[PDB]
Design an enzyme around this catalytic site. Structure first.
Site, PDB file in Angstrom:
ATOM      1  N   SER A   1      76.688-107.389  53.242  1.00  0.00           N
ATOM      2  CA  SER A   1      77.478-107.843  54.394  1.00  0.00           C
ATOM      3  C   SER A   1      77.212-107.151  55.720  1.00  0.00           C
ATOM      4  O   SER A   1      77.592-107.675  56.760  1.00  0.00           O
ATOM      5  CB  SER A   1      78.983-107.749  54.109  1.00  0.00           C
ATOM      6  OG  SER A   1      79.396-108.819  53.288  1.00  0.00           O
TER       7      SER A   1
ATOM      8  N   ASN B   1      81.292-115.922  53.263  1.00  0.00           N
ATOM      9  CA  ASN B   1      79.863-116.104  53.560  1.00  0.00           C
ATOM     10  C   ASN B   1      79.617-117.537  54.036  1.00  0.00           C
ATOM     11  O   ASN B   1      78.752-117.782  54.877  1.00  0.00           O
ATOM     12  CB  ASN B   1      78.999-115.900  52.311  1.00  0.00           C
ATOM     13  CG  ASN B   1      78.950-114.470  51.865  1.00  0.00           C
ATOM     14  OD1 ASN B   1      79.203-113.555  52.647  1.00  0.00           O
ATOM     15  ND2 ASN B   1      78.596-114.262  50.605  1.00  0.00           N
TER      16      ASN B   1
END
Ligand SMILES: O=C(O)c1sccc1S(=O)(=O)Nc1ccc(Cl)cc1
Length: 355
Positions: free
Chosen positions: A61, A149
């Site tokens: 991330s 996401n």
């Protein structure tokens, strides 16, 4: 190599690696703008390859900070606007639930409930279109934040459409190259394979698997030197010569929404400095749906902030945090995915001591 830095880092990281059983780790501390590096263990246990300043780690991330900045650069270039409807850049997205969902919502996880992951089943362009067309939001846009996401991943893909460049090409030419991040990649080339550490999950060596919008949400791999440089760039954007990139970095740290004591930027997340450590530490624990207050209009990047991002993959764990006002930052890269709170705790112990 100030002894104070040496001591706080080692005294904090050694116990961490022991307790969490981390195979290998790299740490960079940016103090008064200058970087200091530390490495431990192995990048490849079987081949006895040690972690070095050139070892590549999967950022997971933390990649979203690159996506947020690239998006910011596109806004500065006048190619997109965060107020633009998603459908402006994806005409095929005709389903009515998309009316009112802007690029800002995608970028900040506030579209109304987009899922954490794009289904592993999605393996083509028509598959992705169907996925978004059939997605039913749970909330109106701009009301709740749900880390995803599928949300910032789509933002990244659309943000580069006007340029005509692929997401990777755009990232390389507009962000990596200008910042001299010459060992940062979306796809690791053969020339760097020798430096690509293995991630370790339950003792087995693993690398991230291909996935839809992986480049945009968790596809960056980088070295501790390049990440130190990424931190320096985000700490002091005015030193960046490329105007639109400097502006993109500023836009990525602007405060768009607030939930509790945290503010959502583009990729980056921020809290006012001084911060309550218990706030960031317990706060980094893994993703819930939280109502958000819009900051209307967004507050430009606040120097007195604790700016950070946690990231992981099946076999890696990473964390970045910096405080613009203090010219201080830290990067922690490890080839084992260990508890987020432990990363935040160690990072706070180090920066608090140096601040
Ligand atoms: O990187 C992270 O911290 C989180 S958290 C939830 C999702 C993510 S991510 O998709 O960006 N990173 C990630 C994590 C595990 C695997 Cl197997 C693959 C990718």
């Amino acid at each position: 190599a100030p002894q104070q830095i040496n001591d706080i880092v080692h005294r904090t990281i050694t116990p961490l690696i022991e307790q969490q059983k981390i195979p290998g780790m790299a740490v960079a501390v940016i103090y008064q703008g200058k970087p200091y590096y530390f490495t431990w263990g192995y990048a490849d246990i079987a081949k006895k390859q040690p972690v070095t300043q050139q070892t590549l780690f999967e950022l997971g991330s933390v990649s979203k900070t690159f996506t947020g900045v690239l998006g910011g650069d596109a806004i500065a270039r006048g190619e997109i606007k965060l107020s633009d409807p998603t459908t402006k850049y994806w005409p095929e997205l005709t389903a009515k639930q998309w009316n009112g969902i802007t690029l800002l919502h995608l970028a900040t996880y506030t579209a109304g409930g987009l899922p954490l992951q794009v289904p592993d089943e999605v393996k083509s362009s028509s598959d992705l279109l169907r996925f978004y067309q059939n997605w039913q939001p749970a909330w109106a846009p701009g009301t709740q934040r749900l880390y995803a996401n599928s949300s910032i991943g789509l933002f990244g893909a659309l943000a580069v459409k006007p340029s005509g460049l692929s997401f990777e090409q755009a990232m390389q030419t507009r962000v990596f190259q200008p910042l001299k991040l010459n060992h940062t990649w979306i796809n690791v080339p053969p020339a760097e394979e020798k430096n690509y550490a293995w991630g370790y999950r339950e003792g087995k060596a693993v690398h991230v698997s291909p996935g839809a919008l992986d480049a945009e949400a968790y596809g960056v791999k980088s070295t501790i030197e390049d990440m130190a440089r990424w931190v320096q760039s985000n700490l002091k954007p005015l030193d960046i010569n490329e105007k639109t990139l400097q502006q993109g970095i500023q836009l990525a740290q602007s405060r768009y929404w607030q939930t509790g004591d945290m503010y959502q930027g583009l990729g980056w997340e921020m809290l006012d400095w001084p911060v309550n450590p218990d706030s960031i530490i317990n706060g980094s624990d893994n993703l819930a749906a939280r109502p958000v207050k819009a900051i209307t209009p967004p507050t430009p990047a606040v120097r007195a902030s604790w700016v950070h991002k946690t990231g992981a993959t099946g076999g890696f764990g990473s964390y970045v945090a910096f405080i613009p006002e203090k010219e201080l930052g830290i990067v922690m890269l490890a080839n084992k995915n260990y508890p987020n709170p432990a990363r935040v705790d160690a990072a706070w112990q180090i920066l608090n001591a140096l601040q």
